[PDB]
Amino acid sequence: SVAHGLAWSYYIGYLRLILPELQARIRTYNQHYNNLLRGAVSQRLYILLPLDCGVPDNLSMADPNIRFLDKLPQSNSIYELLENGQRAGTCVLEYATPLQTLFAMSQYSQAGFSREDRLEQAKLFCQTLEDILADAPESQNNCRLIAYQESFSLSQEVLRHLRQ
Amino acid sequence: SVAHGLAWSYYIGYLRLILPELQARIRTYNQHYNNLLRGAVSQRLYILLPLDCGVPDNLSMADPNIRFLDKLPQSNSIYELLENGQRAGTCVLEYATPLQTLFAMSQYSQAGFSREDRLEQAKLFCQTLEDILADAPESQNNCRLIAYQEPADDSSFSLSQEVLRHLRQ
Numbered sequence: 001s002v003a004h005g006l007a008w009s010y011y012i013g014y015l016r017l018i019l020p021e022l023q024a025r026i027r028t029y030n031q032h033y034n035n036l037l038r039g040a041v042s043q044r045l046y047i048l049l050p051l052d053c054g055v056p057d058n059l060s061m062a063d064p065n066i067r068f069l070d071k072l073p074q075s076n077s078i079y080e081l082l083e084n085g086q087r088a089g090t091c092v093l094e095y096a097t098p099l100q101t102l103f104a105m106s107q108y109s110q111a112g113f114s115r116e117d118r119l120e121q122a123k124l125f126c127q128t129l130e131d132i133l134a135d136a137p138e139s140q141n142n143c144r145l146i147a148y149q150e151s152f153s154l155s156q157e158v159l160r161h162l163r164q
Numbered sequence: 165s166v167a168h169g170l171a172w173s174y175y176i177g178y179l180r181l182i183l184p185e186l187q188a189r190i191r192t193y194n195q196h197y198n199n200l201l202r203g204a205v206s207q208r209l210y211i212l213l214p215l216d217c218g219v220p221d222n223l224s225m226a227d228p229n230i231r232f233l234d235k236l237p238q239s240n241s242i243y244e245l246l247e248n249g250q251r252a253g254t255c256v257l258e259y260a261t262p263l264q265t266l267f268a269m270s271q272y273s274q275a276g277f278s279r280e281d282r283l284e285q286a287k288l289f290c291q292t293l294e295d296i297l298a299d300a301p302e303s304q305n306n307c308r309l310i311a312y313q314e315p316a317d318d319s320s321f322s323l324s325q326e327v328l329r330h331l332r333q
């Protein structure tokens with residue numbers, strides 16, 4: 001099961017290191033860099049987990065209601081989320097980039113990995129990641145996993161989690 | 165088994181992309197960017213796979229007989245290898261950095277991952293990675309995996325000697 005190792009790496013080699021000082025980085029942005037009125041960036045890292053493992057080049061080509069806003073200071077990006085043609089939220093948003101391995105494996109004949117195998121691994125990755133973060137010290141209330149399957153709205157998917 | 169996913173990621177996300185173009189990068193370097201009165205860099209990517217999963221940050225401090233030379237142009241580094249205090253070879257050398265996950269996990273109480281669990285996973289990583297590269301198109305004659313278990317006795321192993329043995333083959 002390839003997902004097991006991907007989810008551990010994602011956590012241990014990345015989340016474990018960026019999550020402890022994430023809220024301070026958002027706090028600096030809100031207080032000193034934010035030129036947006038009433039639009040404060042949310043306190044959590046929103047992680048996009050598409051079950052089809054399709055990670056685009058840039059986030060905005062996937063949805064026109066997701067617009068790049070700034071780089072989070074001190075590798076992370078801030079986006080504005082549109083609802084009804086208006087800014088409905090602002091957050092630090094990204095893809096769980098280890099999903100690229102599952103998509104690349106499904107695209108390599110010698111891996112013997114079908115689309116059905118990919119979907120199962122994608123789901124397994126999400127569940128293993130949920131279990132790791134649940135027992136993780138630095139991941140108490142600063143991380144949000146947005147798992148989804150696909151006119152679909154990626155912005156409406158993020159906004160529901162933001163409202164939570 | 166954490167190793168299965170690490171080995172696939174290492175290959176599909178990295179090796180598959182750098183190996184096809186590697187020999188041309190070394191050729192250009194040797195012809196246009198290398199110092200005249202010095203050794204030509206070897207044509208393969210030498211990958212260090214320590215079974216204890218200890219990746220050293222700065223490779224030049226793991227062994228004093230391994231000295232940084234230059235960056236390969238167009239993320240890869242060139243090193244000189246010393247034998248008896250003299251330059252015995254030059255190559256593009258690196259660690260299989262996904263091994264860092266196995267070491268970090270062994271250092272995290274909540275992972276329930278022992279040293280014995282880590283050794284088994286490093287073994288499976290090497291085993292999987294070898295099988296992948298064996299059937300892989302882009303791995304022509306441009307990649308060598310250097311797997312090594314450091315023996316209890318410090319006097320019976322040298323990292324530079326380990327690399328030079330592969331370089332000579």
Ligand SMILES: CC(C)(C)c1ccc(N2C(=O)c3cc(F)ccc3[C@H](CC(=O)O)[C@H]2c2ccc3c(c2)OCCO3)cc1Cl
Pocket residue numbers: 005006007009010097098099100101104173174175176177178179181261262
């Ligand atoms: C489709 C392309 C563009 C080829 C791609 C992109 C990224 C990745 N990566 C991963 O999937 C990956 C997987 C992990 F479990 C941990 C970290 C990464 C990282 C995640 C990241 O960089 O955001 C990465 C990866 C995969 C293999 C590597 C590596 C990095 O760095 C050098 C060693 O091998 C893989 C592919 Cl197939």
Ligand SMILES: CC(C)(C)c1ccc(N2C(=O)c3cc(F)ccc3[C@H](CC(=O)O)[C@H]2c2ccc3c(c2)OCCO3)cc1Cl
Pocket residue numbers: 009010011012013014015097098169170171173174261262263264265268
């Ligand atoms: C000990 C420290 C320093 C904390 C460490 C260092 C590297 C890594 N990485 C990996 O182990 C890793 C594992 C993979 F399967 C593929 C690619 C990577 C890459 C390999 C590389 O960068 O050379 C990486 C990794 C691991 C998780 C990631 C990521 C990158 O990029 C962003 C997404 O999550 C992990 C740790 Cl624990």
Ligand SMILES: [Ca+2]
Pocket residue numbers: 315316317318
């Ligand atoms: Ca010893």
Ligand SMILES: [Ca+2]
Pocket residue numbers: 318319
């Ligand atoms: Ca010693």
